[PDB]
RNA sequence: UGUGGCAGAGAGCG
RNA sequence: CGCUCUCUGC
């Protein structure tokens, strides 16, 4: 169970990236 | 015309005996055929009453079988006790189920044996699991088994339904057969002596499980049902509350692609706007913990469906969530105890660490809002403030529940809780004293009532005296009638539809703005609804008192103020065995005239006060805030584009800025969606909560076996439109079993479709769902004329109460507060109006309705009566119909779906014509005369009375107006103008406008002002008869729509209506 | 934020159409124009604030004495007054002129207010922007029942296949100054082509923008009120003259509407990278004239400005589409030129073009033929290769 | 053809009838239907030929 | 008057179809008053117009 | 004839004078 | 050869048969199939040779 | 004869 | 506008 659960936690991070956030993050 | 076949099969299945015989009774509006029906009846009874075979005559009288209309079927069958098991053993070959007592927090909320919790029957109570419905579990099981039996030979997808429901019903019947079936008494209760050796919560589990398994059409439905039915047998406190909670986060994950909007002027207007879903990261961790609780409780398949759905976050698979969100509330109620249910609310944490900068602004905003509400009437010296006492005494709701009391009307004793009857009692004995407000203290604490609703807590209800209402009435009525011209309240956003209650989730949404939405239902015991709230209103009253010069108004305002003073310290009667507890609760709840608007005010002030702290860290322009009592959402727009971190930080700031006021909250921020108790939007598409238990109720009403079938059908229709679909045949089976009546132990009668589906006071359902039906034939006319003759009935209890001294005294005392020159025109009128709310008293309604049913049965048994010409609606429709002409048409698809959970035919209509462009005809007695009386008085004389009064001379009319406080000059002007002939015509126009048949559940949503529907309705214009052409166009629209619903295809129409029939119909228009 | 000189950024390739898909690639241009239209619909503002509907309709039913209960009876001056069409027209006009998509009209002749609000439509919007048969029918109808009956002229004798539209051949017949100059404006209303910031643009007249066309319209309509209708009875004239007084009373709001459309149109035009050509199309967009009448009758003191974020969103979308378009063009041109210079004779240059159309995420390759692909290839042969690819090939 | 019903809508919105009058214009609407226009169109040509 | 062009169309159509079905005639066609007549309701003309 | 009642005559008579004095 | 349906879907919109009052709204696009193209290709050559 | 409401809107009875 | 039912914020 929990291996697949942690991968489920992970795939909702890489996905749905906003553009302003990565801009300010590259600067920061 | 199919119900009756299922009725025949049900009768054949349930009784099955040689002794079980079946006896139709028919009717026809045609003399000859009717006399042949009488004959048929006679000969059938005789033959039955002579031990002769009945099967021989059934061929001979074929004419009755072809042209006559059925009423009912009788049944002579003996006791045959215990037949449920004798049928049920076969459908119970699986293994029964074991509870798990260590799941729920409490002890008695586990589904353990009754005797382990209630050894004595004197301390037994079925109220913690009462289904509260006059139909038995055995009835439900019989219906299920009959359905299963008839669907025993089909081979299709239907068979996949049969296998699924058979496995579920096996699980259920295995659980019941382990012990047996409880047997109902005459009252449909279940006594101690049957439940003594069985689980306490087996019945509700059974009923709820039947309701769920009867709503299974797919594999995922089967998964949900097996996964809830097996856990709802033990878990009864952390199931609907659990699974219904994550949904509030899920709505913040659905990208909008296509939208519906609403104007300030309240009109839908679609938009192709796309909006992303800027969800923060930590709410996913919250959601995972919620799923961890979900799995920890014992749920395996339904976390799997919610986790694998997030891989795509698509909106096509999303209704499943909504479906799941409705499968949680069809498990039953958590009917716990009065004590522990109050103590769910009566836990308080009041602290000397909050701000003072917050409470002072809060108090002020409440003050300012009150002044905005009350500036105009307090200043212009309105009659309703002057005469607040009389206003409250007329508007006494006669279910109001203040303080059960022993009465006596002549030679009886009554234990009424109704405040109108209490007032009648107190007027006589000199105790009526509305200026002296009673305290609420140690010497007189308050009772309680219990509001249950699944998936949430049991909420509490104050049960106050009758002085508080009288004080609060006038001011709260002006508050409501003001603020429904104004934003921020449900009174402004409410008639039926989308374009209403919300109507601005979806204007101010894009990738610049966000929306913070928040449930505030626990905020009744909070530290910000105590002292500052009351003192703010008190301060506003001081300002308003100094903003007027008349004295009755100052008295009313000072009484409302003193009410808030006394309510600031308030104790609460709750027994527990022998001793009585009274708890300090100096805060707000319902059971008051004030609670809705005042809670809305306080939440508005609170959110306005909080929102001036986010400004210390963000730049935004507040576009909209909305408050409807215990919920709230605010949209806000930024100088830039939105990010994940700003939503997260805003949410944390909201949580902590409420924490600074000692206020708990689950802060929820999003971009596309919200969640509140009754509804929510995702991807620019409105869904709804379908959580209305059918086979289990909240409380015990007062209605009959009959009307509960109608309520159950209404709830079925609602839940079906909402999304939760139950098998209609089951519903019809329940309707026949609930309209079945026992004339003896062995005689039983069963009505037919043509008695239950006819527009009357006995209507239960409709022959085709989502369509009220009218009558073009002779036969509906015949029985409608018959039943309208019978609706008017008497109540001897009401007759003797209205003939006592207190009722006469009450009318006189109401009278004497006004002028003293009318005695046979209004005193009878006020008595006749009070009669309309004496019927709330249950024995009056029961006497009348049992009498009404007896009158029905004494013409169901024997043949029928012509009823002597009394005109109704179907008489008119019979004459309008034969000058129509149909032709096949073809409308295209050009309108957007925004209510996906609807059936595809209703949606097809929405997908071919528009959703609502809303209209108004009258906002209540608008025409000429009641808006004068409502300016100089509050009295609401019935339009019957006005239709008579205007027909009288202009002298006693003048006396009558002067008697209502009006001067002589305006009466003189009214008589000189010659408006009485006009208000005859306006009143009769209002009579035709009383036809409420536009809003039953499917006509609720359709746009009849459409151009596409209209180009089909080719009715030429004549003029100078507006009512007729109005109703003709309307009725033609209803024809087209009903054909569309029931058959899908479209049609046009044409009515070259002759002028002769316009005039012949015109006199029946403005009557009845 | 201040950005350092250590930073960098990449520029898109915003080189205009090397292919001229508005020259006989109509099946692709229909899809492209539809795509840009539907994109523009998602950023045109919703008419957030209005004047009411029930009260406005009551003013219509208290001015026009079709009474009582003409709420439900709906054939004359009415039947499409709602919000749900006014927004459609507001959205459609702007999105069509931006995407340059022709729009056809589905109306009824019994409804004369639709004919009246079509005047405002055919003035504020050019006539070469519509499709021919629809506005021919509408102009013909207007002429036959508002204009020529206002001077005792004959109805008309119009011919189906006539090179000129009725307003042109009517401009010279009737002798009234107001209507003549109004019709002159209408007939000679057209777009103004102009290249700005590199991109061609179809711009309005600069008289429509600062709304004064509506004053010529009001002049004409007031004149027609002042005439008599000798050929026709009193009730008909009464109905018509009330129908146009109902527009006279909404004059200033119409002017404001015109200025607002022009402003939002140019504001959204600003966020365009690909030149916007004026060419008729296969598929159209329906426009009920009741959806103009609604807009012209449900409107007032409520301005709507596109948010900057909608503009930035729309601009970045168009940039990305244009950059993808040019880059994939350069890919295809590189492989074609290289294949032709390496003597590859067995190689069928189709799958490359199929890939080219697949990477443009708007087409349906299931229903596009080989001939369009080969013509597109024939055009792609004649394009210079970009510097990178050319140097790598040499 | 134009349908009978839409033509009657146009004619009735033109004529502006009165349901409380003995008018000299309801009799215009007698027999406007198709299957008669066909009959007349057929009869004229058939009779002039024969 | 609001069916002007349509009546022109109708007239051209009647004349054409008449003289075309006249081309398919072989026996010379005489102008004579016959015994019995064909009824003709002008409502059936109105309809056509 | 819409709203030719008393209680507004008084309201206007009172409102005008009290405004012009205040 | 070229896919049949690919040509049908585009011809339907290049000619726009969903806007005309004609008696051939589903009859222009009949006989476009293979089993007729190659049949014609055989018929032509065979007739010119023979 | 033993008792569970305030107001909003939608139906059914006056 | 007076009462029962549907849910609604309670």
Automatic annotation (TrEMBL), chain A:
<comment type="subunit">
    <text>Homodecamer; each decamer is made up of two conformers of VP2, called VP2A and VP2B. Interacts with a VP1-VP3 complex. Interacts with the intermediate capsid protein VP6. Interacts with NSP5. Interacts (via N-terminus) with NSP2.</text>
</comment>
<comment type="similarity">
    <text>Belongs to the rotavirus VP2 family.</text>
</comment>
<comment type="function">
    <text>Inner capsid protein that self-assembles to form an icosahedral capsid with a T=2 symmetry, which consists of 120 copies of VP2, with channels at each of its five-fold vertices. This capsid constitutes the innermost concentric layer of the viral mature particle. It encapsidates the polymerase VP1, the capping enzyme VP3 and the genomic dsRNA, thereby defining the core.</text>
</comment>
<protein>
    <recommendedName>
        <fullName>Inner capsid protein VP2</fullName>
    </recommendedName>
</protein>
TrEMBL record, chain B:
<comment type="subunit">
    <text>Interacts with VP3 (Potential). Interacts with VP2; this interaction activates VP1. Interacts with NSP5; this interaction is probably necessary for the formation of functional virus factories. Interacts with NSP2; this interaction is weak.</text>
</comment>
<keyword id="KW-0548">Nucleotidyltransferase</keyword>
<feature type="domain" description="RdRp catalytic">
    <location>
        <begin position="500"/>
        <end position="686"/>
    </location>
</feature>
<comment type="function">
    <text>RNA-directed RNA polymerase that is involved in both transcription and genome replication. Together with VP3 capping enzyme, forms an enzyme complex positioned near the channels situated at each of the five-fold vertices of the core. Following infection, the outermost layer of the virus is lost, leaving a double-layered particle (DLP) made up of the core and VP6 shell. VP1 then catalyzes the transcription of fully conservative plus-strand genomic RNAs that are extruded through the DLP's channels into the cytoplasm where they function as mRNAs for translation of viral proteins.</text>
</comment>
<protein>
    <recommendedName>
        <fullName>RNA-directed RNA polymerase</fullName>
        <ecNumber>2.7.7.48</ecNumber>
    </recommendedName>
</protein>
<keyword id="KW-0946">Virion</keyword>
<comment type="similarity">
    <text>Belongs to the reoviridae RNA-directed RNA polymerase family.</text>
</comment>
<dbReference type="Pfam" id="PF02123">
    <property type="entry name" value="RdRP_4"/>
</dbReference>
<keyword id="KW-0808">Transferase</keyword>
<dbReference type="InterPro" id="IPR001795">
    <property type="entry name" value="RNA-dir_pol_luteovirus"/>
</dbReference>
<keyword id="KW-0460">Magnesium</keyword>
<keyword id="KW-0694">RNA-binding</keyword>
<dbReference type="InterPro" id="IPR007097">
    <property type="entry name" value="RNA-dir_pol_reovirus"/>
</dbReference>
<dbReference type="GO" id="GO:0003723">
    <property type="term" value="F:RNA binding"/>
</dbReference>
<dbReference type="GO" id="GO:0019079">
    <property type="term" value="P:viral genome replication"/>
</dbReference>
TrEMBL record, chain F:
<protein>
    <recommendedName>
        <fullName>Inner capsid protein VP2</fullName>
    </recommendedName>
</protein>
<comment type="subunit">
    <text>Homodecamer; each decamer is made up of two conformers of VP2, called VP2A and VP2B. Interacts with a VP1-VP3 complex. Interacts with the intermediate capsid protein VP6. Interacts with NSP5. Interacts (via N-terminus) with NSP2.</text>
</comment>
<comment type="similarity">
    <text>Belongs to the rotavirus VP2 family.</text>
</comment>
<comment type="function">
    <text>Inner capsid protein that self-assembles to form an icosahedral capsid with a T=2 symmetry, which consists of 120 copies of VP2, with channels at each of its five-fold vertices. This capsid constitutes the innermost concentric layer of the viral mature particle. It encapsidates the polymerase VP1, the capping enzyme VP3 and the genomic dsRNA, thereby defining the core.</text>
</comment>
């Amino acid at each position: 169970n929990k291996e697949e659960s942690k991968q489920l936690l992970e795939v909702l991070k890489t996905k749905e990236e906003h553009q302003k956030e990565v801009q300010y993050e590259i600067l920061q | 015309g199919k119900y009756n076949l299922i009725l025949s099969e049900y009768l054949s299945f349930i009784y099955n005996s040689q002794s079980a015989v079946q006896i139709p009774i028919y009717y026809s509006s045609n003399s000859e055929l009717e006399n042949r029906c009488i004959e048929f009846h006679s000969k059938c009874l005789e033959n039955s009453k002579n031990g002769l075979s009945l099967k021989k005559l059934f061929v001979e009288y074929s004419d009755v079988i072809e042209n006559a209309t059925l009423l009912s079927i009788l049944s002579y069958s003996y006791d045959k006790y215990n037949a449920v098991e004798r049928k049920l053993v076969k459908y119970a070959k699986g293994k029964p189920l074991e509870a798990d007592l260590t799941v729920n927090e409490l002890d008695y909320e586990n589904n353990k044996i009754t005797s382990e919790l209630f050894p004595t029957a004197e301390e037994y109570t079925d109220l913690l699991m009462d289904p509260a419905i006059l139909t038995s579990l055995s009835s439900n099981l019989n219906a299920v088994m009959f359905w299963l039996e008839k669907h025993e030979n089909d081979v299709a997808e239907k068979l996949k339904i049969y296998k699924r429901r058979l496995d579920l019903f096996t699980i259920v019947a295995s659980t019941v057969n382990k012990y047996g079936v409880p047997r109902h008494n005459a009252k449909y209760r279940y006594e101690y002596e049957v439940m003594k050796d069985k689980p306490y919560y087996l019945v509700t589990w059974a009923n709820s499980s039947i309701e769920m398994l009867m709503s299974v059409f797919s594999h995922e439905d089967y998964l949900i049902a097996r996964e809830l039915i097996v856990l709802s047998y033990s878990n009864r406190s952390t199931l609907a509350k659990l699974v219904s909670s994550p949904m509030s986060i899920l709505v913040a994950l659905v990208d909008i692609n296509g939208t519906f909007i609403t104007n300030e002027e309240l009109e839908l207007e679609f938009s192709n706007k796309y909006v992303r879903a800027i969800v923060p990261d930590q709410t996913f961790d919250e959601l995972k913990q919620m799923l961890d609780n979900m799995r920890k409780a014992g749920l395996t398949d339904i976390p799997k469906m919610i986790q694998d759905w997030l891989v795509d976050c698509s909106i096509e698979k999303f209704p499943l969530m909504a479906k799941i969100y409705s499968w949680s509330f069809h498990v039953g109620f958590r009917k716990q105890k009065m004590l522990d249910a109050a103590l769910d609310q009566l836990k308080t944490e009041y602290t000397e660490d909050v701000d003072d900068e917050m409470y002072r602004e809060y108090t002020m905003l409440i003050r300012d809002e009150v002044v905005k509400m009350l500036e105009e009437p307090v200043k212009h010296d309105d009659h309703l403030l002057q005469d607040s006492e009389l206003a409250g005494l007329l508007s006494m709701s006669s279910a109001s529940n203040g303080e059960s009391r022993q009465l006596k009307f002549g030679r009886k004793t009554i234990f009424s809780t109704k405040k109108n009857m209490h007032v009648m009692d107190d007027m006589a004995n000199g105790r009526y004293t509305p200026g002296i407000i009673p305290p609420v203290n140690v010497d007189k604490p308050i009772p309680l009532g219990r509001r249950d609703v699944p998936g949430r807590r049991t909420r509490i209800i104050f049960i106050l005296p009758y002085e508080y209402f009288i004080a609060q009435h006038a001011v709260v009525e002006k508050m409501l009638i003001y603020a429904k011209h104004t934003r921020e309240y449900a009174e402004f956003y409410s008639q039926s539809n989308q374009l209403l209650s919300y109507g601005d989730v979806t204007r101010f949404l894009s990738n610049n703005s966000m929306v913070l939405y928040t449930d505030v239902s626990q905020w009744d015991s909070s530290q910000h609804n105590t002292q500052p709230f009351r003192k703010g209103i008190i301060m506003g009253l001081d300002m308003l008192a100094n903003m007027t010069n008349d004295a009755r108004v100052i008295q009313t305002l000072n009484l409302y103020k003193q009410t808030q003073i006394n309510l600031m310290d308030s104790y609460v009667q709750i027994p527990d065995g022998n001793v009585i507890k009274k708890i300090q609760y100096g805060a707000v709840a319902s059971g008051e005239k004030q609670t809705k608007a005042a809670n809305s005010i306080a939440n508005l002030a609170l959110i306005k006060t909080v929102l001036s702290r986010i400004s210390n860290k963000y730049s935004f322009a507040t576009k909209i805030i909305r408050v409807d009592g215990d919920d709230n959402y605010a949209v806000l727009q930024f100088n830039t584009e939105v990010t994940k971190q700003m939503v997260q930080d805003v949410s944390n700031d909201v949580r902590e800025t409420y924490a600074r006021m000692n206020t708990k909250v689950k802060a929820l921020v999003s971009t596309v969606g919200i969640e509140i108790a009754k509804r929510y939007i995702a991807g620019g598409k409105i869904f709804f909560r379908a959580g209305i238990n059918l086979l289990n109720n909240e409380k015990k009403g007062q209605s009959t076996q009959w009307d509960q079938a109608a309520v159950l059908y209404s709830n079925y229709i609602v839940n079906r439109l909402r999304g939760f679909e139950t098998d209609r045949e089951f519903i019809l089976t329940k309707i026949m079993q609930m309209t079945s009546v026992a004339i003896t132990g062995s005689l039983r009668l069963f009505p037919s479709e043509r008695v239950l589906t006819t527009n009357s006071t006995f209507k239960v359902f409709d022959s085709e769902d989502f369509i009220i039906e009218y009558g073009t034939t002779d036969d509906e006319v015949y029985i409608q004329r018959a039943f309208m003759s019978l609706s008017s009935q008497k109540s001897g209890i009401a007759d003797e109460i209205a003939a006592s001294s207190t009722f006469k005294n009450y009318v006189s005392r109401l009278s004497e507060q006004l002028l003293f020159s009318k005695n046979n025109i209004v005193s009878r009128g006020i008595a006749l109006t009070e009669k309309a709310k004496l019927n709330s008293y249950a024995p009056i309604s029961l006497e009348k309705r049992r009498a009404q049913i007896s009158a029905l049965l004494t013409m169901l048994q024997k043949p029928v009566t012509f009823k002597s010409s009394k005109i109704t609606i179907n008489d008119i429709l019979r004459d309008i119909k034969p000058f129509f002409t149909v032709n096949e048409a073809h409308l295209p698809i050009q309108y957007q779906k925004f209510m996906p959970t609807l059936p595809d035919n209703v949606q097809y209509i929405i997908q071919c014509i528009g959703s609502r462009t809303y209209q108004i005809e009258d906002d209540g007695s608008k025409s000429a005369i009641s808006r004068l009386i409502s300016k100089y008085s509050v009295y609401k004389p019935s339009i019957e009375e006005l239709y008579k009064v205007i027909s009288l001379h202009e002298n006693e009319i003048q006396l009558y107006l002067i008697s209502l406080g009006i001067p002589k000059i305006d009466a003189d002007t009214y008589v000189g103008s010659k408006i009485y002939s006009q208000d005859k015509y306006r009143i009769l126009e209002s009579y035709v406008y009383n036809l409420l048949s536009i809003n039953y559940g499917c006509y609720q949503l359709f746009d009849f002002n459409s151009p596409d529907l209209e180009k089909l309705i080719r009715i030429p214009f004549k003029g100078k008869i507006p009512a007729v052409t109005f109703i003709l166009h309307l009725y033609a629209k209803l024809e087209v729509i009903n054909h569309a619903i029931k058959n899908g295809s479209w049609i046009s129409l044409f009515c070259n209506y002759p002028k002769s029939e316009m005039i012949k119909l015109w006199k029946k228009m403005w009557n009845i | 934020r201040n950005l350092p000189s250590t930073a960098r950024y990449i520029r898109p390739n915003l080189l205009q159409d090397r292919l001229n898909l508005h020259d006989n690639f109509e099946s692709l241009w229909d899809t492209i124009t539809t795509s840009n239209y539907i994109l523009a619909r998602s950023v045109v503002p919703d008419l957030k604030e209005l004047v009411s509907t029930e009260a406005q309709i009551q003013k219509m039913s208290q001015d026009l004495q079709l009474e009582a209960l003409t709420i439900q009876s709906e054939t004359q001056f009415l039947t499409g007054i709602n919000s749900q069409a006014a927004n459609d027209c507001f959205k459609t006009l702007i999105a069509a002129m931006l995407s340059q998509r022709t729009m056809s009209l589905d109306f009824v002749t019994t409804n004369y207010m639709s004919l009246i609000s079509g005047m405002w439509l055919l003035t504020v919007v050019p006539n070469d922007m519509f499709i021919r048969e629809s506005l021919v029918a509408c102009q013909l109808a207007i002429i036959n029942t508002i204009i020529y009956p206002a001077f005792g002229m004959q109805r008309m004798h119009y011919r189906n296949g006539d090179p000129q539209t009725p307003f042109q051949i009517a401009e010279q017949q009737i002798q009234n100054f107001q209507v003549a100059n109004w019709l002159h404006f209408v007939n000679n209303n057209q777009f103004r082509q102009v290249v700005i910031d590199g991109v061609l643009n179809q711009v309005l007249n600069d008289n429509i923008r600062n709304g004064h066309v509506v004053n010529q319209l009001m002049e004409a309509l007031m004149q027609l009120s002042r005439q008599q209708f000798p050929t026709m009875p009193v009730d008909y004239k009464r109905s018509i003259q009330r129908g146009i007084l109902l527009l006279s009373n909404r004059l200033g709001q119409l002017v404001d509407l015109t200025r607002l459309l022009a402003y939002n149109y140019e504001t959204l035009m600003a966020c365009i990278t690909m030149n916007m050509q004026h060419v008729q199309t296969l598929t159209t967009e329906k426009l009920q004239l009741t959806s103009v009448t609604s807009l012209c009758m449900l409107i007032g003191n409520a301005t709507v400005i596109p948010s900057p974020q909608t503009l930035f969103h729309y601009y970045n979308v168009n940039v990305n589409f244009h950059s993808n378009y040019n880059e994939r063009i350069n890919d295809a041109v590189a492989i074609i030129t290289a294949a032709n210079r390496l003597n590859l004779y067995q190689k069928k240059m189709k799958s490359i073009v199929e890939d080219f159309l697949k990477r443009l995420q708007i087409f349906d390759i299931s229903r596009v033929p080989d001939d369009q692909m080969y013509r597109l290839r024939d055009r792609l042969r004649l394009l210079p290769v970009e510097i990178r690819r050319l140097d790598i090939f040499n």
